[PDB]
Amino acid sequence: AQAEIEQELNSVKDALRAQVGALAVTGAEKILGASIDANAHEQLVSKLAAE
């Protein structure tokens, strides 16, 4: 009657979090798939060669 009310309340936040996280990953994929071109490899392949 009190702990179970908090049990449902936090479970709803997690159900939303599971969808928002998927959307945030999809957003990052769409952004990078347009923001990356030949000007990025001279800043990434060059970085890996030091790692």
Next chain:
Amino acid sequence: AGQQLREAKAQAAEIVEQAKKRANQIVDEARDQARTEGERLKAQ
């Protein structure tokens, strides 16, 4: 003397059995009220 002792002892057993019978009513009525209020809060 023996007859009244057997009668008193028989009534003593009945007095204690009625107390046990009463205890179950006190406990189960508290369970139904507490569970009903829990559902009242859960729906809200």
